[PDB]
Write a protein that binds this DNA or RNA. Structure first.
Ligand SMILES: [Zn+2]
Length: 645
RNA sequence: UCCAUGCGCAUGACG
RNA sequence: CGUCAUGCGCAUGGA
């Protein structure tokens, strides 16, 4: 392509660069062009032609292995589409020793490199290659993993320069808008761009200026648009005030925010440091009440009632299964005295939801397509069920994959499923997952959201088909945030055009400085990291429960499996804990009712594994970490010769 | 295909 | 530095 021609042109001979273009301009295709010409150059030179294409995500890897690299190189060259989940019969160093072209994923590579410079399995170095290709360069700032790679590259380049010579590979680099970082200033942005380049050790950026018109003919752009707009709550607030007085809790802030939550968690910390009740227990309950609040700010109040209903339901189930004090008695009765009545209040009408329904219905009377963003998963589920109740345009939710923070997440397969159904669902409900292959779209809304400029442009790329209906529902400073996204998009060109028109000498000087700076930063960080974990004590401690400061385990009685998990056999421990299971790894609970861990099935054994998240330490410098890795002191791996017979 | 777990990473808001 | 929310990758064991 013509616009692609010049931007590719320098890379054809040396010229480790960056490229940045907008959505839809087929950057994969030009990348293929550079590949084929490079490999043909190596056939002309009879040199080791190798390309080790990198990404951040598996799905783009599979996508390109289907659609882009094979259909243009299926004949000439060897290709393979790699991942961490796709079980490959062979290790990585062989697909280095074969398969001249590689689609891949990042941390596979770094793992092989570590195995190189740390023993185990046959390693690999960068010197085996002649070229590297990247997508989404903008992640190359804050030691994100595909930046260890270039720090190694920079280390070896400076070894070459102190020599000045073992060779090193050409380095392409692609991206959308390259992102700007922590800026209200042009100088900071410029410095950021230079940090990015020197983390890639590139030469220029080389964007498109000549043929912007033939390209503009392709990209129909969206229209930047804004479309913007008790008593049940107050009863709950009065309950909260009652509880504050009940245990002398000083908020130092208002109800319905994050600050209140933060102070509650700090009370939980202090009271575990004390081992005292009525203090952290209230922190937990008020954390729950504040959840209910700041969903009530945005969600139908029935959903908060259901949230806390299931909560206290589980609480009663815990305590009864335990039995099968005044504090929990007060709290439970305080809830259940108002439970049914608040259920009654929840049905009453009287919002963001109302303007929202209005906009939505008006578009679907205008138009077919539908996209929704927001912050959280529970919001997606709740609004999905709610619109399923409200008289309608079928719908479906979407969320990510992490098994974190409340929910049973979804599946990659099922994500693909729902996306194809949308290629048929009318309106999707998603968290920040949806920069992906969803085009020909109208009404990407932002219901109670914030995003950054790069997320903004990735959302732009998804709304197409000659119809943009950017909508925003948060007012009754968020309009500020689209305005600053525009401002940053202006600033980025303002800085790129300043650095393109820059001397090569001073350019090289600044980039060398930033390279040395980042390398020394990594070195000092590794120093402090090695200094970090040095204790490795067998048994120095006693693990106690956190509601009740009762002894639970000792320092030596613990053992390790899978070099991941911890366990306490020695059924003197078994005199303590209680089991539960409802809906196949059953859960443990306390002699009070605290939840502790899981009965993990391992090699026939029902080992009781516990999570440090729900226990407290006594070396009494009481401490708490939430993660074993925080704790330097080491425990042994298990020897089954104990359990025999 | 599903389950559970550990680890690292970035983003945004907040202090 | 911590908190929250969100998203991503890798490595495990099992069905
Ligand atoms: Zn207890």
């Amino acid at each position: 392509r013509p616009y692609q021609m010049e931007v590719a042109q320098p890379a054809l001979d040396g010229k480790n660069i960056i490229i940045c273009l907008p959505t839809g301009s087929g950057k994969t295709r030009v990348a293929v062009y550079i590949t084929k010409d490079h490999l043909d150059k190596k056939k002309q030179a009879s040199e080791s032609g190798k390309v080790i294409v990198l990404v951040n995500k598996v799905m783009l890897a599979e996508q390109l292995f289907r659609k882009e690299f094979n259909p243009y190189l299926k004949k000439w060259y060897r290709i393979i589409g790699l991942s961490g989940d796709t079980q490959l019969k062979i290790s990585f160093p062989e697909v280095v020793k074969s398969y001249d072209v590689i689609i891949s994923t990042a941390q596979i590579l770094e793992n092989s490199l570590l195995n190189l410079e740390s023993g185990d399995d046959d390693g690999v170095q960068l010197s085996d290659f002649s070229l590297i290709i990247i997508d989404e360069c903008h992640h190359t700032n804050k030691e994100a993993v595909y930046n260890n790679i270039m720090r190694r590259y920079l280390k070896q380049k400076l070894r070459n320069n102190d020599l000045k010579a073992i060779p090193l590979p050409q380095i392409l680099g692609l991206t959308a808008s390259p992102g700007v970082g922590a800026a209200k200033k042009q100088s900071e942005a410029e410095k950021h761009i230079l940090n990015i380049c020197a983390n890639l050790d590139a030469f220029t950026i080389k964007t498109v200026k000549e043929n912007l018109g033939q390209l503009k003919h392709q990209i129909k752009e969206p229209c930047k648009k804004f479309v913007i707009a008790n008593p049940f709550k107050e009863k709950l607030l009065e309950i909260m005030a009652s509880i504050q007085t009940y245990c002398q809790k000083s908020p130092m802030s208002d109800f319905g925010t994050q600050h209140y939550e933060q102070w509650a968690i700090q009370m939980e910390k202090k009271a575990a440091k004390d081992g005292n009740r009525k203090d952290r227990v209230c922190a937990e309950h008020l954390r729950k009440y504040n959840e209910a609040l700041q969903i009530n700010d945005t969600i139908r109040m029935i959903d908060a009632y259901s949230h806390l209903e299931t909560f206290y339901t589980d609480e009663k189930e815990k305590k009864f299964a335990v039995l099968n004090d005044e504090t929990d008695e007060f709290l439970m009765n305080l809830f259940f005295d108002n439970k049914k009545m608040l259920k009654k209040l929840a049905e009453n009408p009287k919002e963001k939801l109302i303007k929202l329904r209005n906009t939505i219905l008006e578009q679907f009377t205008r138009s077919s397509r539908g996209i929704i963003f927001t912050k959280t998963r529970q919001s997606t589920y709740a609004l999905s069920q709610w619109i399923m109740e409200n008289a309608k345009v079928k719908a479906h939710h979407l969320i990510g994959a992490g098994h974190s923070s409340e929910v049973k997440p979804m599946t990659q397969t099922e994500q693909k499923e729902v996306i194809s159904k949308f290629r048929t669902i009318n309106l999707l409900i998603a968290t920040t997952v949806a920069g992906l292959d969803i085009k020909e779209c109208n009404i990407v809304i932002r219901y109670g959201l914030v995003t950054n400029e790069i997320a903004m442009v990735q959302a732009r790329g998804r709304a197409r088909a000659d119809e943009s209906t950017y909508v925003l529902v948060t007012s009754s400073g968020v309009t500020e945030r689209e305005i600053v996204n525009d401002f940053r998009e202006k600033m980025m060109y303002k800085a790129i055009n300043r650095v393109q028109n820059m001397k090569p000498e001073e350019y090289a000087h600044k980039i060398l400085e930033l390279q040395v700076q980042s390398i020394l930063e990594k070195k000092m960080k590794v120093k402090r990291s090695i200094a970090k974990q040095y204790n490795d004590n067998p048994s120095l401690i006693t693990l106690l429960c956190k509601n009740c400061s009762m002894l639970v385990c000792s320092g030596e009685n613990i053992h390790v499996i899978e070099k991941m998990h911890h366990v306490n056999m020695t059924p003197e421990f078994k005199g303590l804990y209680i089991v539960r299971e409802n809906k196949t790894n059953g859960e443990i609970i306390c002699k009070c009712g605290q939840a502790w861990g899981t009965m993990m099935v391992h090699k026939g054994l029902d080992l009781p594994c516990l999570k440090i998240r729900n226990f407290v330490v006594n070396f009494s410098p009481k401490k708490q970490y939430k993660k074993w890795v925080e704790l330097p002191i080491r425990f042994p791996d298990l020897d089954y010769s104990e359990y025999c017979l």
